[PDB]
Amino acid sequence: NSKIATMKGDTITVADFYNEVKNSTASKQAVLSLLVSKVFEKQYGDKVSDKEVTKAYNEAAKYYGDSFSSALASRGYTKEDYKKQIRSEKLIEYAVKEEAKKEITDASYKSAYKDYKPEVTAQVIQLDSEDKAKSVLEEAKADGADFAKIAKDNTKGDKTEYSFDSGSTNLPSQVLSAALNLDKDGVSDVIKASDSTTYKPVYYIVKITKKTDKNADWKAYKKRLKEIIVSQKLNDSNFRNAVIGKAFKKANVKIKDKAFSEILSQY
Amino acid sequence: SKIATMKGDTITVADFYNEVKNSTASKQAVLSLLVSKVFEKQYGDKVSDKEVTKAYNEAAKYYGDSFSSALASRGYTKEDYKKQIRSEKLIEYAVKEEAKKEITDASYKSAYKDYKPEVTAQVIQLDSEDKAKSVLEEAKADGADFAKIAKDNTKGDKTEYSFDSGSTNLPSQVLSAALNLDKDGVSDVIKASDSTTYKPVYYIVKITKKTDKNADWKAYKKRLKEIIVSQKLNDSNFRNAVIGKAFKKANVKIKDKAFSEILSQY
Ligand SMILES: [Cl-]
Ligand SMILES: [Cl-]
Ligand SMILES: [Cl-]
Ligand SMILES: [Cl-]
Ligand SMILES: [Cl-]
Ligand SMILES: [Cl-]
């Protein structure tokens, strides 16, 4: 198309260049990125505001602090490519969440009520040492239980008052799940759980404070249950590849150059 | 000129170029092409595509059948590899030729200065430093014993080696230290290392036949002429210079600012 470098005789052109990086595994990620952008920018471009993109960018900075500038250059990213990738993950997210709320049927709300426990409120005791978890346990199982005290005088940190459903993100699955099975004013056992980043086995002790009735009507919890089916679909690759496989067809996307033929081998 | 199409929008090669031009991988692509074309019109007839095929076959036999997967693990193709062997040979020939031009008499003076006559010794290669001591002391009985205890002890294939101060037969340690002995005599346990593994190898050199310096140039020229080349040949700083010159002759100049300082190192 254009010229890149000149020399006596032959010269480098945008074509000669493309003919080299054309089959580059890194080029496939580029073409596929332009498709996702142009497609979702026309079908959802107005949905996600450039104001939301900023909020996410500013938070991304506040976290890495004065390391953000470095952290980016590290994994090969300019401060414009990052703020540009935050928008795409937010477009595909908006699309993945509206279509996840369309397919919802009756059988789904009924297959989501089976394995669902009502919201609970307990006194959690997080610990790093397992022998200390076995210690606070017998103190909790004494004549003067006084669990709340044992908690506030031993917890690894954070708080002691925790509220959670069955499919809610608040405590490790191990804890979250074993905790619900307990009944009104029921003390747990030493629960071993991995950490989100340090993988340092954290040991928890939970005691149910206030709990409610399981209930039997599905329409009763359509609020929680509905946002839970979306929460799962939104976290499912096969479903995300699918909503992309849809938008791409709705945009009648069709590759011309063979090199990138296997790009939509998952859409 | 277009890559993919859609409803009311199109992805042309222009959009793509404006996406990966500032990429680090793309900077290498421009350079590789710029390097090839220049060394092709200036030294293409010097490197025969028949000489590249032999160099390629050597790589194959070495990696054996795993050559296919090996290239895949490095991201190379089975043509891009052979393609790289050519540019790796064009530049190599330019360095040898270019380095064999500004050769001055003073260059031969600084070469004969620290040079030493070619010597032949009955070397011994060992794994553990422990036996490296055992073989030495048992070699200190009558003297001529070292001969037989050098055949059934050396971990290497041959014992007789022919080297000077510019060869790369034995390690630099076991090389220079082996040129500090007399016409005859053994040496101390030289602690060296392997190229493939880091395993420390312990050598024991024994001079058998030596020559002597002739305090002259041509007395040792074809050797002091190859050493200067092999030195500028392995000097990255000088290698950059030849590229800087080839590019200077082809009057090379970039037009897109997206690849401005790609020759700042050249
Ligand atoms: Cl829609
Ligand atoms: Cl609190
Ligand atoms: Cl249960
Ligand atoms: Cl002089
Ligand atoms: Cl004998
Ligand atoms: Cl031999």
Numbering used by the authors:
A (entry chain A): 28 to 294
B (entry chain B): 29 to 294
From the paper:
Here, we solved the protein structures of two secreted parvulin and two secreted cyclophilin-like peptidyl-prolyl isomerase (PPIase) ATP-independent chaperones found in gram-positive streptococcal species. Two types of ATP-independent extracellular PPIases exist in pathogenic streptococci: the parvulin and cyclophilin families. Unlike cytoplasmic PPIases, extracellular PPIases have canonical secretion signal peptides that allow for their translocation across the cell membrane via the Sec pathway. These chaperones are lipidated to the outer leaflet of the membrane and function in the space between the bacterial membrane and cell wall.
Other streptococcal-secreted PPIases, such as S. mutans PrsA (SmuPrsA), are required for cell wall and membrane integrity and virulence in an infective endocarditis model. Additionally, the secretion of mutacin, the major factor in the colonization and establishment of S. mutans dental biofilms, is dependent on SmuPrsA. As key streptococcal virulence factors are dependent on PrsA for activity, we began characterizing streptococcal PrsA by determining the X-ray crystal structures of PrsA from S. pneumoniae and S. mutans. The SpnPrsA and SmuPrsA structures were solved to a resolution of 2.55 Å and 3.15 Å, respectively. As expected, SpnPrsA and SmuPrsA align well with an r.m.s.d. of 2.36 Å across 264 Cα atoms that share 49% sequence identity. Consistent with PrsA homologs, both streptococcal PrsA proteins have a central parvulin PPIase domain (SpnPrsA residues 143–241) linked to a foldase domain (N- and C-terminal regions). Furthermore, the streptococcal PrsA protomers are linked by a domain swap; protomers A and D each donate a segment of α1 and the β1, β2, and β7 strands to the domain swap. The interprotomer, three-stranded β-sheets formed by β1, β2, and β7 strands are presumed to interact with the cell membrane. Previous work of L. monocytogenes PrsA homologs has shown that dimerization is critical for PrsA function. This is consistent with our dimeric SmuPrsA structure, as is the dimer of dimers observed in the SpnPrsA structure.
